[PDB]
């Protein structure tokens, strides 16, 4: 897909929709079976349309900026625990020309505490969106199991919204969250 | 993949292993967007290997029964709120046998109240397996969006464990989908 600089993405015409996406993650010393290290807890969401994506949403008229809407979309999607933290410009990573009509996507990534992250998993089922535009949260498995396939490689065979799969890969590399 | 009656599978030597799956569902009057009926809320686990499947698991020998073992497995995976109900032999649907691995797979379905099922979802992250063998719970979308693609058919392009996708399609056919 077509990478764009943030400023050129804000410059696009009035017929463009802007959509904001957050990778929310925290460190995880946990060990699966006491032997495979999780390394980090990273969240993704099953969308209404059967696809895996990131938390976020379309920025609306009364949004004074990308971040105020992003955070607003998160609270609607994840519930009150999202209020504990605020995704900010420093967390911004990239902007992409999405798919379909005139849509451009902004990708953020925000390190939390494991308690913060867990507190968002635990309340996510009382949110406005849940059971409607949102079907379920899952953690991205960062390990590859003994048969060579189960874990991350298998998990990437799933359906992703737009280009989420590519943004995820890029972010695990840039943030060093594998190997 | 062959189909077996229960007593046939229960006769088989002790070294054969047993795996038991439960499809938990509940009527959901909900309307997605105000326009698309949900009909039923059904739950699926995303297992540790990246594959989606029903809650369930292997029986160990401290499990007396197919059902104790199944019901043991659900408490571990979904938490305390699984105790609201017990999956019984009356909810048995079928059994299947594989090629290579010597395991019989038994399939169950258990009708909940919607509040029962939401308590299972709400309580799910305090379950022992959460963040280890279970990565999270999804609902199954039973609709198809206008495009013929978004919804159930895309949900079906995910990766699944074993006979889950099939077991789901089987259960949807009986329910009136
Ligand atoms: Na599991």
Residue numbers in the entry:
A (entry chain B): 4 to 182
B (entry chain A): 4 to 180
Quote the study that presented this structure, word for word.
A similar cleavage reaction was observed in vitro with other enzymes from diverse organisms, including a snake venom phosphodiesterase (SVP), mammalian ectonucleotide pyrophosphatase/phosphodiesterase 1 (ENPP1), Escherichia coli RppH (EcRppH), and Homo sapiens NudT16 (HsNudT16). In this study, we sought to understand how HsNudT16 binds and hydrolyzes different forms of ADPr using X-ray crystallography.
Observing that His24 came within close proximity to the adenine base, we also designed H24W mutant to improve base stacking. Contrary to our hypothesis, the structure of the HsNudT16 H24W shows that the indole ring of the tryptophan, instead of improving stacking, protrudes into the adenosine binding site, as demonstrated by structurally aligning with the HsNudT16-ADPr model. H24W mutant had no significant activity towards free ADPr; consequently, the Km was not measured. The insignificant demodification activity with H24W mutant with protein-conjugated ADPr as well as its Michaelis-Menten results on hydrolysis of free ADPr could be explained by the position of the tryptophan in the structure, which suggests that H24W occludes the recognition site of the purine. Under the tested conditions, demodification assays of MARylated PARP10CD showed no clear changes between wild-type HsNudT16 and all mutants except H24W, which had minimal hydrolysis activity.
